[PDB]
Paper text:
Here we report the identification, purification and characterization of a novel anticoagulant ringhalexin (Ringhals extrinsic tenase complex inhibitor) from the venom of H. haemachatus. Ringhalexin exhibited a mixed-type inhibition to FX activation by the extrinsic tenase complex and also exhibited a weak, irreversible, neurotoxicity on chick biventer cervicis muscle (CBCM) preparations. Thus, ringhalexin exhibits mixed-type inhibition of FX activation by extrinsic tenase complex.
There were three protein molecules in an asymmetric unit with each molecule consisting of residues from Arg1 to Ala65. This flexibility suggests the possible role of loop II residues in the function of ringhalexin.
Residue numbers in the entry:
A (entry chain A), B (entry chain A): 1 to 65
Write the structure that this text describes.
Amino acid sequence: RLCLSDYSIFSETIEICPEGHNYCFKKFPKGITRLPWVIRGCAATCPKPEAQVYVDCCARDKCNR
Amino acid sequence: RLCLSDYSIFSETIEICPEGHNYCFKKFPKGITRLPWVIRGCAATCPKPEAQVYVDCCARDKCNR
């Protein structure tokens, strides 16, 4: 499985997932619009979210944008 | 298309991409901070990544920094 590490304009950073990891996730904060941190990577299971955080979880190549 | 071959301070090494190659890429390892190798060049398609490697893939002149 291939996930994105970063995504912008069209600049995407691509990684190949470890064995058994077939999910791509994206983590971002809930009340931030003024240039928020965003976290991406591979996962064996959809990451559980934290207090003020959403996690996108998807299962296709380079899906977490 | 023009891609970077090397980039630093402000010293950039510039190349002109072959016909049909309109992507610039950048390849770098995943757990290395202590002066890592970095690979840059032109591409017809975004290079697939390797085990412990990220590949940036972008589509503008001299975009892979």
